[PDB]
Design a protein around this ligand. Structure first.
Ligand SMILES: C[C@]12CC[C@H]3[C@@H](CCC4=CC(=O)CC[C@@]43C)[C@@H]1CC[C@@H]2O
Ligand SMILES: c1ccc(OCCSc2nc3ccccc3[nH]2)cc1
Length: 244
């Protein structure tokens, strides 16, 4: 019975620091390069985490890289909102212990409205009173929530895995159980429009980066110019539970 949860809680990654120098005055270039660095850092964890998920290693290996590459934004954002919820009560954006966005940093990052949506996301955990177990299952399901419209190499395996994760979440929930399931499914869905705003933003930023003194690490640069445009151009689409 508690085997699946045991794994989720066991493999949950720990604190990742951004490397940000809070002594330097908040500037758009500084704030954004630190996010990029954080992103690159958190990426390593996401890989090791994902490969340690129950059933994940039996996806086709190409599909293993692909789904990680399409879903990191949504994963990292959903986690951050959780950190923000548990650490600063959704009042600020707790990207890392060494990189917390107050109101001022939200403005300086030129990402204000996105940050507002992300804060809203964070406030939801409070609103819905999400248990940590619910959070871990939802976060794992997020990794199977976005795919090419033309299918993966072994779609069959993907579909079975995804179904198992959905039934895992149901179990963790269980009128009361019906309403509840609807809520987390709508909450999970709400992650995708936010991920997309961030995909749009980071892509525009990459294009004009040499122009605005904002550095991108190798893996971020690679992914944002090869994988993210597939999402933007509509070759990769998220899987929503409810019709938008
Ligand atoms: C993509 C990004 C750098 C990586 C950030 C991302 C915002 C969302 C986010 C939350 C995290 O906790 C990890 C870093 C990431 C993934 C940043 C938005 C603009 C910047 O380029
Ligand atoms: C191929 C496809 C999926 C696979 O597992 C998906 C993990 S879901 C799951 N939840 C469980 C809960 C209890 C016991 C076993 C469980 N398996 C394994 C091989």
């Amino acid at each position: 019975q508690p085997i699946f949860l045991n794994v989720l809680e066991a493999i949950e990654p720990g604190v990742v620091c951004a490397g940000h120098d809070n002594n330097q005055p908040d500037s758009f270039a500084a704030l954004l390069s630190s996010l990029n660095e954080l992103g690159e850092r958190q990426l390593v964890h996401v890989v090791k985490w994902a490969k340690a998920l129950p059933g994940f290693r039996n996806l086709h290996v190409d599909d293993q890289m692909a789904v990680i590459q399409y879903s990191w934004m949504g994963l990292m954002v959903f986690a951050m909102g959780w950190r923000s919820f548990t650490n600063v009560n959704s009042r600020m954006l707790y990207f890392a212990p060494d990189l917390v966005f107050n109101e001022y940093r939200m403005h300086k990052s030129r990402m204000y409205s996105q940050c507002v949506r992300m804060r809203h996301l964070s406030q939801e955990f409070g609103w819905l009173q999400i248990t940590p177990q619910e959070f871990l299952c939802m976060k794992a399901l997020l990794l199977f929530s976005i795919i090419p419209v033309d299918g993966l190499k072994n779609q069959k395996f993907f579909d079975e895995l995804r179904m198992n994760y959905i039934k895992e979440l149901d179990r963790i929930i269980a009128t009361s159980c019906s309403r509840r399931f609807y809520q987390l499914t709508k909450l999970l869905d709400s992650v995708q429009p936010i991920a997309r705003e961030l995909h749009q933003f980071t892509f525009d930023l990459l294009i004009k980066s040499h122009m605005v003194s904002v550095d991108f690490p190798e893996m971020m640069a690679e992914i944002i110019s090869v994988q993210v445009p597939k999402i933007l151009s509509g070759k990769v689409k998220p899987i929503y539970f409810h019709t938008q």
